[PDB]
Design a protein around this nucleic acid. Sequence first.
RNA 1: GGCCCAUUCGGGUCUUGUAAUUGGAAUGAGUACAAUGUAAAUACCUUAACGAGGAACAAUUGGAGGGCAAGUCUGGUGCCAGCAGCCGCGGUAAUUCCAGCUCCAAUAGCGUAUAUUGGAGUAUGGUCGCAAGGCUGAAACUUAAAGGAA
Lengths: 51, 103, 350, 363, 49, 49, 46, 287
Amino acid sequence: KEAHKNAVIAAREGKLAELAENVSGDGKRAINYQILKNKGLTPKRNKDNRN
Amino acid sequence: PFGGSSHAKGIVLEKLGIESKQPNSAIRKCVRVQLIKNGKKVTAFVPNDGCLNFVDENDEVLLAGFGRKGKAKGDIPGVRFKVVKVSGVSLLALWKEKKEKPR
Amino acid sequence: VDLEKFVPYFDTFEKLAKKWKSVDAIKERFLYDTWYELQKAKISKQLEINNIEYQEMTPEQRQRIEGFKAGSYVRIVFEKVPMEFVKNFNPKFPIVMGGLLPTEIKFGIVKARLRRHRWHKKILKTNDPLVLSLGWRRFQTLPIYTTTDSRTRTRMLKYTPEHTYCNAAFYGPLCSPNTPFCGVQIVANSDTGNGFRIAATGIVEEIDVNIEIVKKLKLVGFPYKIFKNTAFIKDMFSSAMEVARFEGAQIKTVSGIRGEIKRALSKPEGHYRAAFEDKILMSDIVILRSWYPVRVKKFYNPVTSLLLKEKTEWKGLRLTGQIRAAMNLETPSNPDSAYHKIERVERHFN
Amino acid sequence: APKYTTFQGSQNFRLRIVLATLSGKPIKIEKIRSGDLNPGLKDYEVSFLRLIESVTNGSVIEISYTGTTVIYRPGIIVGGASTHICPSSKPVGYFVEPMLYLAPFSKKKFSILFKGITASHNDAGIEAIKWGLMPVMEKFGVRECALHTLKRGSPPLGGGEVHLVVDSLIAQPITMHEIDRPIISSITGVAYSTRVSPSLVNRMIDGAKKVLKNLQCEVNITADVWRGENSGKSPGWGITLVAQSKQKGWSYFAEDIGDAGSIPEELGEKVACQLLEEISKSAAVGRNQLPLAIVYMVIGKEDIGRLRINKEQIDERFIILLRDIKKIFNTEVFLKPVDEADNEDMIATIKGIGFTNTSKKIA
Amino acid sequence: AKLVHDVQKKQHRERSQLTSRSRYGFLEKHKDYVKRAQDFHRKQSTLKV
Amino acid sequence: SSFEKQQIEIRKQIEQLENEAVAEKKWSLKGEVKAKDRPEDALLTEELE
Amino acid sequence: FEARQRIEEKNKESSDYHAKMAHIVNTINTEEGAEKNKYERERKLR
Amino acid sequence: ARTMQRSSDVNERKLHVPMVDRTPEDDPPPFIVAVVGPPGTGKTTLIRSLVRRMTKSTLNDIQGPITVVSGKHRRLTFLECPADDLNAMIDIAKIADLVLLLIDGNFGFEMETMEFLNIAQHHGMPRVLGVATHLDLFKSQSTLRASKKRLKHRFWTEVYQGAKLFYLSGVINGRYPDREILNLSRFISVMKFRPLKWRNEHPYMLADRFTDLTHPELIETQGLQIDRKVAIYGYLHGTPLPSAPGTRVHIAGVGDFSVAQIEKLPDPCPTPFYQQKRLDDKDKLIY
RNA sequence: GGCCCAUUCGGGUCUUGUAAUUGGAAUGAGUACAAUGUAAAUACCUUAACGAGGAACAAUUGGAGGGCAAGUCUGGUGCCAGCAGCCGCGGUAAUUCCAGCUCCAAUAGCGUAUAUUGGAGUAUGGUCGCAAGGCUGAAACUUAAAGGAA
Ligand SMILES: Nc1nc2c(ncn2[C@@H]2O[C@H](COP(=O)(O)OP(=O)(O)OP(=O)(O)O)[C@@H](O)[C@H]2O)c(=O)[nH]1
């Protein structure tokens, strides 16, 4: 039972580890794509209408 | 409908039918608005229940004509107007999450 | 003379009628273009009346009645200011003094419509702390997110709806209704990261001293002996007294078949008899819907950032996932609660 | 430390409790009837405190064991519908009158049903509350206020029921400007009789018309005889006279009831003469109408409101009114004489505290 | 869908039979109950005739 | 200091709320409950609508 | 006893809700439709 | 005709909600000009340049509010918001009248700027003027104009349409160029302010000077830990504050206190209109 | 198996479907070297070097139609009907789910509002007015002679 507990908590701290790697080391907090583009709530749209 | 104008400006007095139980009914979407240039009190449609959270008391709103194309089953005939903007920001953009209300 | 005595003082009837045989004493008394401009005219008239009256009053009584008018350089002396403010005073950080209206001194239950911010990534959780900036004050509190079951009650929600406003209730300093506010999860630069920080926005609808919030309670029972329209139900209750309080209640099946609790069986204790509108199955589950009150937690943690030496890295109550990761505990999971792919065979009959 | 605002004496008990309720500040009323034959609260005062607890919510009222100390920490005004049984010591008017102060500023509407004695000598009658006080509330902005007499009960057995409904939940009273003296358009009245012969109403009306025939204005006094179960238990009669201004809308009133062993014409002449006395002593409001107007201009928005009051109207109860208001709201009434040298009238200018109705739900 | 977000029309997934009750088989819903009840009513009507 | 003392009781309340947030739900705050999950004869003491 | 009290209260609440909703809808229909009909008469005149 | 219909529409645009100003016409307070930006944008140098242009005096150390007689009838209280404190941003967004919002032109928008914009929008919208700095770091002029237009469009999406995004070329002698500061000061002078609801209902005050009045002998007898008596000097905004003591105030970040003493003082930075067409150099004052 | 027509019954037709895999080629936006250009510079012309698989180098705007729950509300002559449903029971590193539900049209454009080229009879929880009810004498009186009914 405790081995299963160590396995699941290891998976959780691993996921938080990839999140800590994904966050940037640079001091400046840059705007992200969602705030930059401001697409809003949009439906799924076909690729054919792009061109 | 309005005197010589396509759109009118008003102050939201109250939201009628918020104590009604059925979501997205016309009674749920009715809003009473007092027009600025006359002081006349008219009922308008907020387009959705989602926009009814954005509409609040004593805000300025821009009203246009409603313009039904066909007779729906559950609509309220007689309400002739719809709310287009609130606090200078369009209700559709607020609903689609492209803007925030300035207050 | 008391004002409890509503009828005012009067003289004797004889002297009063002798004085009022004549009537000559009181014989003198008897005998815009737009609505917007009209409203502005009324406002301007009230303002100029205020100006004339304040002008004709003497300046000392003018100061007493009006108070210190805006634009006046003033010195204000406070007692009981904490030591840490003077000790750690930093001139770069501002000092803002705002007067409090009488409602804003009180503490009670604030009810407000509230939505998770668009640029905030995750949803918010019931009974999970949030720093609210309501009025002049910023304070960390525990809100409860509620819903109206089609305007019939206030039912507790486990999370805020994404992309939607929901009713929320929290304990804090009361404010005037129709007041907007923001809510931030973290105010510490050690915690900021790359994420957008503003978590919730909202507006106050109502204030009160208490609120009745309910959470749904489903009592779950199982059939062990089934007849036509009559079933014997087990595991819902533990004794015939518990059954006898709930006798006559609506129950229903996960299939959707409606029924009534009728009587308590003698043996064994928790079992009861029920009548349904149709024959039910041994695979069925019987549920009884009830409601249990939920109490709003009374937590008031003000953000006293100026009293700190760092003036950032303010800390408060942590988020539940943070506490779980800190004490190395696993997220509570129910094996029956997971969703699976359901395959149905073709339904045949004899 | 809550730091209670301390008052002394049993004087202005209802006024202090109501002003504490409106200002939200906790009060401590001490040494009430400390040395008397029967020290402590009166039963009607305890009933009034229970009425306040009924109409409000989250309010802590503490009474000492001796009864000489009352501790009151007010709460949110919530209103709602309830039934209040008045004791036999006081009529219904003693409990209805403080509710007019609290009524337009509640979360829900007042619909209160009062059961008890309807009329008495020393307190407000039903016609008094209907026609003297409620026009002032309507002038300050209360659009829908009503008082229905389901049953009428004369002293001492009582047995009447009156229903107070206030449908106008306003944010705050409007600023008032009544510098000019109103002119009276007409005089009306109601002469009522319960459980006694129905000739007494006509006899009272003739006795009052004897006094008021000299007036050029029209005098109309309605005959109100109560029959059946609506008449209550004990017999009585009485007349209420109101002089009304048609243009401005003000009303000045006097009233009385008949005690056991009195001639109706004497009561009619007494009420007519007291009415004329109130016109003589009154400039814009009656002396009995005055605390309504003063408290309303206090709780109005932060603007100067002007109300003309009379040289006779300034007296002792007005002084203690202004002192209690200054103690609670920190508001001083600046008194300005009218420039007209014909009549010594004084303009009362009150800056409103900026009170607002925070109990009402915006939604 | 004129004025409905696509997040309003999310799929609500079906719950399964409890593992302690797995011996009894599949957990019926309204769609299964309607088939069962319609079959019974057709059989009973022709038996009545 | 007074602020330091208030920080002490605030930390006490914070730690108590941390334990409350970590700890298991009450049987009534659990969504679906059986008699096995409940303590015995609880529904006689609690009032439910 | 509690069952009878709850049933009576819920029936009264449902009837009052239905009356209130019908009153609101009827008032809106009558006044607003009267204004709409006057405006349409003006437009067909012009 | 068409002109009449356009006139009706623009009259409908000119219609607005009537609302009480509660602003003293005789001696108005200075407008709070709040410089808000990410930590390296140039707020201190911008305040240096603006003060250098207005009061003809340079300040080596900038901290706390700065009161400056900008025009004949207008005074400005410059406050540089600390970039790393969200609580500071919340207080500034609650009290600020004009917000100079600094955007690094080369890097683009930042989360601090977006957070301050959303806080200001939800509490109450002040008049926002954007200032884009670090445009000299661009290597190509076409990329410079393209980034300029991109910043302008995103800024117009956030703030009301038509709000100015001023462009600053670069520092020459440790301060921004004089012509750019002259145009910026002209924009600040020509801006018009509207009253917000919360500031029209509550009295508030940004502290100009902070001092301690407690007795050192008392401190020596009862240790350092005792509460201190504190005097606060500043200009009053909002509604009039009551003359009698005991009025309850909240100090943002400290707590709730009741006023023990209050006195009016002569104005340290008086306007030349109250002193009495072109503004005089003797009239330009700094506090 | 796809598509077309048709009120249904049906009829007509024939390489179509796949959110399946996989291969190299092309190059514009851009990044950027120079010369040319001009009092000087910009711009233009010319122009090496880099420049694509989620081609995330991330096109919009509108319209039509579903479907789902141990969920919610309303009306009923069981199992229904209606309105609807971001809200379910647990859970937010928590879950990989109608795979992001399907289809249509315009396309760096695309919507909305306003302007402009009667007869006969039902329904009405709106407003207003009129109502309806009691043996009479007889109420503050259980109260007479007469009747009114019987
Ligand atoms: N190249 C260039 N540098 C600039 C410009 N504007 C500001 N700077 C830089 O900004 C630096 C000054 O920093 P500050 O004046 O303190 O700017 P700030 O945003 O207020 O930073 P803090 O006060 O520390 O929070 C100077 O050394 C300049 O190098 C600009 O337009 N171009």
